[PDB]
Write an enzyme that holds these catalytic residues in place. Structure first.
Site, mmCIF file in Angstrom:
data_model
loop_
_atom_site.group_PDB
_atom_site.id
_atom_site.type_symbol
_atom_site.label_atom_id
_atom_site.label_comp_id
_atom_site.label_asym_id
_atom_site.label_seq_id
_atom_site.Cartn_x
_atom_site.Cartn_y
_atom_site.Cartn_z
ATOM 1 N N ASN A 1 36.430 -15.694 7.524
ATOM 2 C CA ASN A 1 37.864 -15.856 7.317
ATOM 3 C C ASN A 1 38.183 -16.017 5.836
ATOM 4 O OD1 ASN A 1 40.724 -17.098 7.366
ATOM 5 N ND2 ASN A 1 40.360 -16.512 9.504
ATOM 6 N N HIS B 1 24.397 -9.924 19.707
ATOM 7 C CA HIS B 1 25.234 -9.092 18.865
ATOM 8 C C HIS B 1 24.743 -9.204 17.429
ATOM 9 C CE1 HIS B 1 27.381 -12.627 17.160
ATOM 10 N NE2 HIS B 1 27.119 -13.148 18.346
ATOM 11 N N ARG C 1 31.807 -5.697 4.548
ATOM 12 C CA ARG C 1 32.648 -5.147 3.486
ATOM 13 C C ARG C 1 31.953 -4.038 2.699
ATOM 14 N NH1 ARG C 1 35.316 -8.148 5.856
ATOM 15 N NH2 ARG C 1 35.847 -6.086 6.723
ATOM 16 N N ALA C 2 32.686 -2.970 2.395
ATOM 17 C CA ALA C 2 32.206 -1.966 1.458
ATOM 18 C C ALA C 2 32.483 -2.475 0.047
ATOM 19 C CB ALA C 2 32.898 -0.644 1.687
ATOM 20 N N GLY D 1 30.167 -17.141 11.540
ATOM 21 C CA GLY D 1 31.182 -16.098 11.620
ATOM 22 C C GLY D 1 32.575 -16.500 11.149
ATOM 23 N N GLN E 1 29.099 -20.134 18.506
ATOM 24 C CA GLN E 1 28.187 -21.161 18.993
ATOM 25 C C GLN E 1 26.742 -20.783 18.713
ATOM 26 O OE1 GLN E 1 28.722 -22.031 23.171
ATOM 27 N NE2 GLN E 1 27.332 -23.787 23.157
ATOM 28 N N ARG F 1 48.284 -3.745 8.465
ATOM 29 C CA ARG F 1 47.000 -4.176 7.906
ATOM 30 C C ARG F 1 46.882 -3.895 6.410
ATOM 31 N NH1 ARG F 1 42.708 -1.953 11.764
ATOM 32 N NH2 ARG F 1 41.230 -3.021 10.355
ATOM 33 N N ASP G 1 26.086 -19.995 27.011
ATOM 34 C CA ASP G 1 26.985 -20.632 26.048
ATOM 35 C C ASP G 1 28.351 -20.847 26.668
ATOM 36 O OD1 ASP G 1 28.356 -18.189 25.837
ATOM 37 O OD2 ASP G 1 27.329 -17.633 23.981
ATOM 38 N N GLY H 1 35.486 -20.826 16.544
ATOM 39 C CA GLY H 1 35.214 -19.404 16.608
ATOM 40 C C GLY H 1 35.699 -18.814 17.915
HETATM 41 N N1 LIG Z 1 37.024 -7.621 26.696
HETATM 42 C C1 LIG Z 1 36.009 -6.800 27.330
HETATM 43 C C2 LIG Z 1 34.619 -7.166 26.811
HETATM 44 O O1 LIG Z 1 34.484 -8.594 26.766
HETATM 45 C C3 LIG Z 1 33.156 -9.122 26.598
HETATM 46 O O2 LIG Z 1 32.596 -8.800 25.319
HETATM 47 C C4 LIG Z 1 32.925 -9.728 24.282
HETATM 48 C C5 LIG Z 1 31.790 -10.739 24.115
HETATM 49 O O3 LIG Z 1 31.561 -11.471 25.327
HETATM 50 C C6 LIG Z 1 32.121 -11.708 22.984
HETATM 51 O O4 LIG Z 1 31.166 -12.780 22.924
HETATM 52 C C7 LIG Z 1 29.897 -12.440 22.360
HETATM 53 O O5 LIG Z 1 29.790 -13.009 21.058
HETATM 54 C C8 LIG Z 1 30.027 -14.413 21.101
HETATM 55 C C9 LIG Z 1 30.296 -14.944 19.702
HETATM 56 O O6 LIG Z 1 31.437 -14.238 19.215
HETATM 57 C C10 LIG Z 1 28.793 -15.054 21.714
HETATM 58 O O7 LIG Z 1 28.947 -16.476 21.746
HETATM 59 C C11 LIG Z 1 28.586 -14.530 23.128
HETATM 60 N N2 LIG Z 1 27.241 -14.890 23.545
HETATM 61 C C12 LIG Z 1 28.777 -13.010 23.245
HETATM 62 O O8 LIG Z 1 29.039 -12.696 24.622
HETATM 63 C C13 LIG Z 1 32.269 -10.943 21.669
HETATM 64 N N3 LIG Z 1 32.553 -11.841 20.563
HETATM 65 C C14 LIG Z 1 33.393 -9.916 21.802
HETATM 66 C C15 LIG Z 1 33.124 -8.966 22.970
HETATM 67 N N4 LIG Z 1 34.203 -7.996 23.091
HETATM 68 C C16 LIG Z 1 32.195 -8.616 27.679
HETATM 69 N N5 LIG Z 1 30.943 -8.175 27.079
HETATM 70 C C17 LIG Z 1 32.798 -7.502 28.533
HETATM 71 C C18 LIG Z 1 33.564 -6.491 27.688
HETATM 72 O O9 LIG Z 1 32.651 -5.736 26.880
HETATM 73 N N1 LIG Z 2 44.548 -10.028 1.536
HETATM 74 C C1 LIG Z 2 44.243 -10.063 2.857
HETATM 75 N N2 LIG Z 2 44.683 -11.066 3.646
HETATM 76 C C2 LIG Z 2 44.401 -11.122 4.963
HETATM 77 N N3 LIG Z 2 43.660 -10.208 5.603
HETATM 78 C C3 LIG Z 2 43.145 -9.143 4.930
HETATM 79 C C4 LIG Z 2 43.414 -9.007 3.487
HETATM 80 N N4 LIG Z 2 42.803 -7.878 3.081
HETATM 81 C C5 LIG Z 2 42.194 -7.333 4.166
HETATM 82 N N5 LIG Z 2 42.396 -8.087 5.269
HETATM 83 C C6 LIG Z 2 41.889 -7.804 6.636
HETATM 84 O O1 LIG Z 2 40.566 -7.267 6.611
HETATM 85 C C7 LIG Z 2 40.410 -6.278 7.632
HETATM 86 C C8 LIG Z 2 39.390 -5.230 7.193
HETATM 87 O O2 LIG Z 2 39.371 -4.139 8.108
HETATM 88 P P1 LIG Z 2 38.006 -3.600 8.811
HETATM 89 O O3 LIG Z 2 37.696 -4.552 9.944
HETATM 90 O O4 LIG Z 2 36.959 -3.406 7.740
HETATM 91 O O5 LIG Z 2 38.528 -2.218 9.465
HETATM 92 P P2 LIG Z 2 38.189 -0.656 9.210
HETATM 93 O O6 LIG Z 2 37.446 -0.380 10.491
HETATM 94 O O7 LIG Z 2 39.533 0.022 9.118
HETATM 95 O O8 LIG Z 2 37.384 -0.498 7.936
HETATM 96 C C9 LIG Z 2 41.806 -5.731 7.907
HETATM 97 O O9 LIG Z 2 42.020 -5.631 9.321
HETATM 98 C C10 LIG Z 2 42.762 -6.751 7.303
HETATM 99 O O10 LIG Z 2 43.541 -7.398 8.309
HETATM 100 N N1 LIG Z 3 38.212 -13.655 10.131
HETATM 101 C C1 LIG Z 3 37.772 -14.572 11.028
HETATM 102 N N2 LIG Z 3 38.432 -15.728 11.244
HETATM 103 C C2 LIG Z 3 38.006 -16.649 12.132
HETATM 104 N N3 LIG Z 3 36.905 -16.504 12.886
HETATM 105 C C3 LIG Z 3 36.148 -15.384 12.762
HETATM 106 C C4 LIG Z 3 36.541 -14.341 11.812
HETATM 107 N N4 LIG Z 3 35.620 -13.365 11.903
HETATM 108 C C5 LIG Z 3 34.706 -13.749 12.830
HETATM 109 N N5 LIG Z 3 35.026 -14.956 13.331
HETATM 110 C C6 LIG Z 3 34.316 -15.698 14.383
HETATM 111 O O1 LIG Z 3 32.910 -15.657 14.245
HETATM 112 C C7 LIG Z 3 32.392 -15.987 15.538
HETATM 113 C C8 LIG Z 3 30.992 -15.426 15.711
HETATM 114 O O2 LIG Z 3 30.204 -15.928 14.639
HETATM 115 P P1 LIG Z 3 28.639 -15.588 14.561
HETATM 116 O O3 LIG Z 3 27.966 -16.737 13.844
HETATM 117 O O4 LIG Z 3 28.553 -14.193 14.013
HETATM 118 O O5 LIG Z 3 28.207 -15.482 16.110
HETATM 119 P P2 LIG Z 3 27.694 -16.646 17.109
HETATM 120 O O6 LIG Z 3 28.797 -17.661 17.168
HETATM 121 O O7 LIG Z 3 27.478 -15.911 18.412
HETATM 122 O O8 LIG Z 3 26.401 -17.148 16.510
HETATM 123 C C9 LIG Z 3 33.371 -15.427 16.559
HETATM 124 O O9 LIG Z 3 33.695 -16.471 17.487
HETATM 125 C C10 LIG Z 3 34.581 -15.026 15.729
HETATM 126 O O10 LIG Z 3 35.827 -15.465 16.300
HETATM 127 FE FE LIG Z 4 26.200 -17.737 14.367
HETATM 128 MN MN LIG Z 5 36.110 -1.825 6.782
#
Ligand SMILES: NC[C@H]1O[C@H](O[C@H]2[C@H](O)[C@@H](O[C@H]3O[C@H](CO)[C@@H](O)[C@H](N)[C@H]3O)[C@H](N)C[C@@H]2N)[C@H](N)C[C@@H]1O
Ligand SMILES: Nc1ncnc2c1ncn2[C@@H]1O[C@H](COP(=O)(O)OP(=O)(O)O)[C@@H](O)[C@H]1O
Ligand SMILES: Nc1ncnc2c1ncn2[C@@H]1O[C@H](COP(=O)(O)OP(=O)(O)O)[C@@H](O)[C@H]1O
Ligand SMILES: [Fe+2]
Ligand SMILES: [Mn+2]
Ligand SMILES: [K+]
EC number: 6.1.2.2
Length: 567
Positions: free
Chosen positions: A315, A15, A419-420, A311, A140, A450, A229, A169
């Site tokens: 937050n 991803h 972010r924009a 990721g 992970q 939101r 993983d 995460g």
């Molecule tokens: N709920 C239905 C979906 O669930 C899963 O996707 C989910 C992925 O499995 C999630 O995990 C992915 O991203 C995580 C990190 O967030 C990686 O550790 C992992 N290798 C990768 O599979 C990802 N973070 C979100 C995504 N929606 C399946 N691909 C099937 C379906 O598309």
């Molecule tokens: N002050 C804040 N505190 C907590 N969460 C926030 C704050 N401002 C923005 N967010 C979160 O950031 C997210 C940004 O939305 P985004 O994923 O970019 O969606 P979109 O596809 O509508 O652009 C929102 O879902 C909102 O929950």
């Molecule tokens: N606002 C958030 N708060 C907490 N966790 C978040 C937030 N946005 C993304 N994450 C976490 O980031 C993780 C993925 O991080 P990333 O480093 O991009 O991928 P990977 O873990 O596959 O290397 C997801 O498990 C997701 O829950």
């Molecule tokens: Fe990562």
């Molecule tokens: Mn946005």
């Protein structure tokens, strides 16, 4: 010159594909695959389009590269979880950079950079600080879900890690999935949290301590023998646990034909807002765990500057409270804290190893493609919409914003990261008590709960926000002063938090000038800045993207390049 192309993205279970090009330690180009392909999250793909853009932007071919860097130790993952790495560097390069798109006389050197190290490099080297504590927290990497490290003298030294089964995460994602918001929308969960109440921040799962946390819910050494993983192992553990301790069972997804849309649409059985208390509780647990980790690595390193990436670093709420913490003086989190950033971080790690010095990111994320007036006009003419070229675009946009109009703003190089930031933005009044509902319900079609976030001149941010520092990326929340918490209703959250962008003349002259003009009209040079896209869809990149979205949504005006289009 030293030229390093960093990559993320692979055809197998991956991803956030992205590509970053460093030329002499400077970012020449950087883009996310999803923005070019229009396929959200850039799943299961080498960063073909992103990398082609990087090369075109810099006027280069693969033959001009000193190295290609990938942001995971892929060979080690294949050896450990899939019974061996089958590819020669040349074969790996044919996958990462297909020859039909990337012709080459010979192979550049290929480097695999360990995943958390790549995350670390994307924070440290671009921070403008020469030393600090490193906290990496994601879903992970190859094995670990947390890395604590020391950044000093241009080196990053790992101090400790946490095994993947204990992933914060994965936890947060699984709670997100459980609520029906979806595992792919953890940002929605973060937003929901303020609307709820926490009673028991352990969730009967976490034990907290001064250095972080424990999860006796799961064997920390659990490994999925059937995957590479611990996502699936943790998903089952968390779903079982949550259903046991929380009054609501999992929210289920519903797929039904909707006669008004003429297609099967996906919805949820319950309203996710119902789970707000679980959201609040999950957010508090996450914060508590990370505060521990952060205090720990800061103490062990003797540093008071904190670097965060991974990721979970997205937050912004957690980040803002870390910043507020007595153990933290300075904090840097890159706009590209997620896997989007490991292309850049791999490139930086390799460039440093090759003897380059990495320039500070510099309060900007604008490294994607830009379009000249001629290119924009050609997309405009394609549609046959009327349009103007205002003598003072910035003044007119400010006046439109002041009057309560929603304005598309597509200028310069596209932002990288989620972010924009005044390159591909939807702008509206910060002062309007109805703007928030209007953009949620009418324009972008989002949940009413939101929140939105503001852009403002750095020069006034001290008066507006409870913290006086640069917030260039909207990646940290902070409190709005009571004097403004009422003046700026559309960009304040349930708990008086906001997730601001501070703007300098240097970072973005045009946006800066627009905000200045706006301040002359509404008192404060502050506007609502949400990303230019239908809720859910990738941020628009090209003039055609922006036009497609401008026309599909009830947006009042579009300032694209030097032109203004009005509905
Ligand atoms: N709920 C239905 C979906 O669930 C899963 O996707 C989910 C992925 O499995 C999630 O995990 C992915 O991203 C995580 C990190 O967030 C990686 O550790 C992992 N290798 C990768 O599979 C990802 N973070 C979100 C995504 N929606 C399946 N691909 C099937 C379906 O598309
Ligand atoms: N002050 C804040 N505190 C907590 N969460 C926030 C704050 N401002 C923005 N967010 C979160 O950031 C997210 C940004 O939305 P985004 O994923 O970019 O969606 P979109 O596809 O509508 O652009 C929102 O879902 C909102 O929950
Ligand atoms: N606002 C958030 N708060 C907490 N966790 C978040 C937030 N946005 C993304 N994450 C976490 O980031 C993780 C993925 O991080 P990333 O480093 O991009 O991928 P990977 O873990 O596959 O290397 C997801 O498990 C997701 O829950
Ligand atoms: Fe990562
Ligand atoms: Mn946005
Ligand atoms: K402080």
């Amino acid at each position: 010159h030293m030229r390093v192309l960093g990559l993320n993205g692979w055809p197998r279970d991956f991803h956030d594909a992205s590509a970053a090009l460093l030329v002499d330690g400077r970012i020449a180009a950087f883009a996310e695959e999803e923005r070019l392909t229009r396929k959200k999250h850039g799943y299961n793909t080498a960063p073909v389009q992103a990398a082609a853009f990087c090369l075109a932007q810099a006027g280069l071919t693969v033959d001009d590269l000193d190295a290609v860097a990938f942001g995971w130790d892929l060979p080690a993952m294949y050896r450990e979880r899939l019974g061996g790495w089958p590819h020669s560097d040349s074969e790996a390069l044919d996958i990462l950079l297909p020859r039909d798109v990337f012709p080459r006389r010979t192979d550049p050197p290929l480097h695999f950079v360990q995943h958390h190290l790549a995350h670390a490099a994307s924070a440290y080297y671009f921070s403008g600080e020469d030393r600090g504590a490193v906290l990496i927290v994601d879903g992970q990497g190859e094995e670990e879900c947390v890395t604590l490290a020391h950044a000093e003298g241009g080196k990053i030294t790992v101090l400790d890690t946490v095994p993947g089964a204990w992933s914060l995460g994965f936890f947060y994602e699984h709670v997100s999935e459980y609520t029906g918001l979806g595992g792919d929308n953890p940002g929605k969960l973060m937003g929901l949290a303020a609307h709820g109440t926490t009673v028991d921040e352990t969730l009967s799962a976490f034990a907290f301590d001064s250095d972080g946390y424990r999860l006796n819910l799961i064997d920390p050494q659990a490994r999925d023998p059937e995957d590479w993983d611990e996502y699936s192992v943790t998903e089952r553990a968390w779903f079982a646990h949550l259903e046991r301790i929380y009054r609501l069972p999992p929210n289920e997804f519903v797929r039904r034909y909707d006669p008004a849309k003429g297609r099967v649409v996906r919805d949820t059985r319950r309203d996710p807002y119902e789970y707000r208390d679980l959201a609040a509780t999950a957010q508090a647990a996450l914060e508590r765990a990370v505060f521990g980790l952060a205090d720990s690595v800061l103490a062990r390193t003797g540093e008071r500057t904190l670097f965060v990436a991974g990721g979970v670093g997205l937050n912004a709420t957690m980040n803002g409270k870390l910043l507020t913490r007595s153990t933290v003086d300075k904090m840097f989190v890159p706009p590209v804290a997620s896997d989007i950033g490991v292309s850049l971080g791999a490139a930086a790690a390799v460039a440093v190893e090759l003897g380059d010095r990495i320039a500070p990111m510099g309060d900007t994320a604008a490294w994607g493609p830009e379009f000249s007036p001629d290119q924009v006009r050609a997309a405009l003419d394609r549609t046959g919409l009327a349009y103007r070229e205002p003598a003072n675009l910035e003044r007119e946009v400010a006046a439109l914003i002041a009057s309560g109009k929603v304005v598309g703003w597509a200028q310069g190089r596209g932002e990288v990261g989620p972010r924009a930031l005044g390159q591909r933005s939807l702008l509206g009044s910060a002062h309007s008590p109805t703007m928030r509902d209007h953009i949620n319900l009418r324009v972008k079609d989002r949940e009413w709960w939101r929140p939105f976030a503001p852009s403002m001149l750095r020069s006034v941010s001290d008066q507006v926000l409870e913290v006086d520092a640069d917030f260039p990326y909207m990646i940290m929340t902070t409190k709005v002063r009571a004097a403004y918490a009422e003046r700026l209703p559309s960009v304040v959250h349930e708990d008086w938090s906001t997730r601001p962008q501070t703007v300098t003349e240097a970072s973005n002259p045009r946006y800066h000038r627009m905000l200045t003009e706006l301040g002359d009209l509404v008192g404060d040079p502050v506007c609502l800045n949400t990303s230019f896209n239908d809720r859910g869809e990738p941020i628009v990149s090209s003039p055609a993207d922006a036009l497609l979205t401008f026309s599909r949504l009830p947006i009042d005006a579009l300032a694209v390049g030097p032109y203004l289009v009005t509905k």
